[PDB]
Design a protein around this ligand. Structure first.
Ligand SMILES: c1ccc(-c2c3c(nc([C@@H]4CCCO4)c2-c2nnn[nH]2)CCCCC3)cc1
Length: 134
């Protein structure tokens, strides 16, 4: 067992707050905001040795990232940004920083009760997206 065990599984989006304004701040255009904001993704998290894999599946896009904690990687996001990402575990929270074009956004995934609470922050705008086990 590892602390990260609490994240493993299939998680379904159950609520979202302020995601449209967060996407505006990230620079996402109108049409992608509307279609992406409509999505109800599942977030599938698994661990094999030191490698964590996080899949996002939805009607909009399916994405997958695999990574080792603290080791930067290149990622293409669902909205087609080309970003440099680093994910760490900080006090029980998975902290995902994405850098591109001199910008940065931070995505925090935390277990709270039976939920996975995900806070996304860009330029002082936060969106909170909550997932429950499938
Ligand atoms: C379908 C719809 C939305 C996304 C998405 C997107 C973004 N940020 C998230 C953040 C990350 C973690 C929780 O939300 C998700 C997401 N990934 N999984 N669920 N949502 C960046 C803003 C532009 C839109 C793409 C992915 C697929």
């Amino acid at each position: 067992s590892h602390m990260c065990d609490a994240f493993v599984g299939t998680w379904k989006l159950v609520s979202s707050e302020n995601f449209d304004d967060y996407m505006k701040e990230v620079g996402v255009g109108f049409a992608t905001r509307k279609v992406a904001g409509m999505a109800k993704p599942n977030m599938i998290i698994s661990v094999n040795g030191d490698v964590i894999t996080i899949k996002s599946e939805s009607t909009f896009k399916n994405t997958e990232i695999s990574f080792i904690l603290g080791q930067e990687f290149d990622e293409v996001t669902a909205d087609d940004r080309k970003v440099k990402s680093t994910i760490t575990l900080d006090g029980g929270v998975l902290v995902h920083v994405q850098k591109w074009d001199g910008k940065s956004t931070t995505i925090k995934r935390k277990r709270e009760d039976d939920k996975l609470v995900v806070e996304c922050v860009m330029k002082g705008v936060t969106s909170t997206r909550v997932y429950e086990r499938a």
